[PDB]
């Protein structure tokens, strides 16, 4: 089978700037090369076919060129909504085969997170487990350090984080950190604190509550 090699794997680009993606085939694939855009949670979207033709309704900023083994996908002036994984695909030899993807990430100015803390609900406590949620909203860059303290004791091994994909409009991230305690342990302690370290903040920010 024909192997499609994409470079780079990742790129970080500011809005208004140029993106150049390359796809290299293991053997000649004529002009039988396609480019797709895949945004988070969506199916791939056809952009370029026959190596250089824009598909219907595809904006002018998107182009493709090349013939044989070496192909180039360009976003002339990248927009914030263009964040996505871009794939090349050959349809010269059977089976059709895809490149490994290039993830286009948007660079923007540093923005500090807004931090919120949520106690467990009374409804949850009935089940014998308490979840405490710390929310970091609308920040950039994604790099962030989040720590849990319970009556000023640092917690380890009982929290998990989730981060959203970059927002298509403001290019920011949001993060949750969730602390899981038994109801017994939750009831044994008073002060619950989420400590956030981020480049946009001069020193770490702590949000806390007192149980009850």
């Amino acid at each position: 089978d024909i192997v499609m090699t994409q470079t780079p794997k990742f790129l970080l680009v500011s809005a208004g700037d140029k993106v150049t993606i390359t796809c290299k085939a293991s053997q000649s694939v004529s002009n039988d090369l396609t480019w797709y855009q895949q945004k988070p949670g969506q199916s791939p979207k056809l952009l370029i076919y026959y190596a250089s033709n824009r598909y219907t309704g595809v904006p002018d900023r998107f182009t493709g060129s090349g013939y044989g083994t070496d192909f180039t996908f360009t976003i002339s002036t990248v927009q914030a909504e263009d964040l996505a994984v871009y794939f090349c695909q050959q349809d010269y030899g059977s089976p059709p085969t895809f490149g490994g993807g290039t993830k286009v990430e948007i660079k923007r100015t540093v923005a500090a997170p807004s931090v919120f803390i949520f106690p467990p609900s009374d409804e949850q406590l009935k089940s014998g487990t308490a979840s405490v949620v710390c929310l970091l909203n609308n920040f950039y860059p994604r790099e962030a350090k989040v720590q849990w303290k319970v009556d000023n004791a640092l917690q380890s091994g009982n929290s998990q984080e989730s981060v959203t994909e970059q927002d298509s409009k403001d290019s920011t991230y949001s993060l949750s950190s969730t602390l899981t305690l038994s109801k017994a342990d939750y009831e044994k302690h008073k002060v619950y604190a989420c400590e956030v370290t981020h480049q946009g903040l001069s020193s770490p920010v702590t949000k806390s509550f007192n149980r009850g």
């Binding site: 895809f98 919120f116 949520f118």
Partner: protein, 220 residues
């Protein structure tokens, strides 16, 4: 216009077969080939094969021929993909797609079907409020949410106010807990003044358990 509507997510035990479907509309179903494409973490996008409803001809990627079988029901405008003797390597999103009669490239895609291969049982989510407080206010804006806890398999969908509220919403990717069950939160930021006039309801749907849950989130 042209639409490819795929069947819902499926949990499948290892060694058991599954059959997923793709219904086409907006064109003459019989006239057009339909392709199947797998997307997984380990192997990215992979073409599985093509069926031509007009002739009944099938062609398979040699890698998939043993485990995949393509069929169609022309009367119901539906193509089927059967995957046999599943293992964890078969957990993936599976797409059906149309070509543009200019070769094997894909202009219309289905929304994808998530197949999870696991020995763990289906479990519908518990949905708890993340109530807004002063601890979740910031100027004229408060944060609130729903914790969607302890479910299996992926995926769940979350909306706010039956889709009437979309701005400021962040639904986090699920994380697998040490228990082997998934959990996520969905949050939204809203004006603090709307907290007494507009009610906020999260709509949590988990198709594998056939559950839909609506939770009103109020200040505590």
């Amino acid at each position: 216009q042209v639409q490819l509507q795929q069947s819902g997510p499926e949990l499948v035990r290892p060694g058991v077969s599954v059959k997923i479907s793709c219904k086409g509309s907006g064109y003459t179903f019989i006239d057009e080939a339909l392709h199947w494409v797998k997307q997984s973490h380990a192997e990215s996008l992979e073409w599985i094969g093509v069926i031509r409803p007009y002739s009944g001809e099938t062609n398979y990627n040699q890698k998939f021929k043993d485990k995949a079988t393509m069929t169609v029901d022309i009367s119901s405008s539906t193509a089927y993909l059967e995957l046999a003797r599943l293992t964890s390597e078969d957990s993936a999103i599976y797409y059906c797609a149309r070509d543009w009669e200019r070769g094997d490239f894909f202009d219309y895609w289905g929304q994808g079907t998530l197949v999870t291969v696991s020995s763990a049982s289906t479990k519908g989510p518990s949905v708890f409020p993340l109530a807004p407080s002063s601890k979740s206010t910031s100027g004229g804006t408060a944060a609130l949410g729903c914790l969607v806890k302890d479910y299996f398999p992926e995926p769940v969908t979350v909306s706010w106010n039956s889709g009437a509220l979309t701005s400021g919403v962040h639904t986090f990717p699920a994380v697998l807990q040490s228990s082997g069950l998934y959990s996520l939160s969905s949050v939204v930021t809203v004006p603090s003044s709307s907290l007494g006039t507009q009610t906020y309801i999260c709509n949590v749907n988990h198709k594998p358990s056939n559950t839909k849950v609506d939770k009103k989130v109020e200040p505590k």
